[PDB]
Structure formats: structure tokens, C-alpha cells
Amino acid sequence: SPYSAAMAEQRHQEWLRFVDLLKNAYQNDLHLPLLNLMLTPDEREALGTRVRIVEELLRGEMSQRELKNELGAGIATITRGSNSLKAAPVELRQWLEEVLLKSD
């Protein structure tokens, strides 16, 4: 079937419902049980790996091929990361540099 702006609107509301639910879970200290409920073990592992990739890409010490060898992540995975980082708002990149990199 063709793309539907109407269906896109439904998907968008459902996504924000998750975002807002998680926001409130953090406020009540229920984020860990909520994330354990909402994600699979494999998704949780993937997110932990993705943070490492973003940190190393921001750092710029390792080449992308070195990262693949070091973390076990395939090139396709690293590329998705690199492309998403390049597409992010500058303010998010600046904040990630502040929190993920050590002062120096």
C-alpha cells in the first residue's frame, strides 16, 4: 500500500507516548524496570555497544577499521553510527563531547 500521512501521524503519536512514558519513569526511579520490560536482552546489548562506538567516533583516536577489530562491531554498524552522528544537531554533538570525553 502507498505511504499514508495519516498512518505516519499515528506512528508519531505512539513513539512520543514511549518517549513521555520513559521520561516519567526516570522521574519516579522506575526507568530500570521499564527498560527491562520494553527492550529485549539483544537490544540492551546493542545500545551499550552503540554508546562505545559514538564515544570512539567523537574521540577520533581509532580508525573505523581499528574500531571494528577492537569492539567486534561490523563495518556496516559503524557506518550507520558515523552517518547518524554527522546528521545530528550540533548542540547534541557538543553535549556528547562534554559528557563522553574526559577533560583534558
Ligand X SMILES: N[C@@H](Cc1c[nH]c2ccccc12)C(=O)O
**Amino acid of residue 13:** Q
Binding mask 24-43 for ligand X (x = CB under 6 A): -------------xxxx---
Alpha-carbon distance of 24 to 16, in angstroms, equals 12
Which of the listed partners (a second copy, ligand X, Na ion, none) does 53 bind, with a CB threshold of 5 to 8 Å by partner kind? ligand X
Give, for 10, the enclosing helix (H) or strand (E).
Answer: helix 5-27
53 binds ligand X (CB under 6 A): yes
The residues binding ligand X (CB under 6 A) are 37-40, 50, 53-54, 77, 80-81, 84
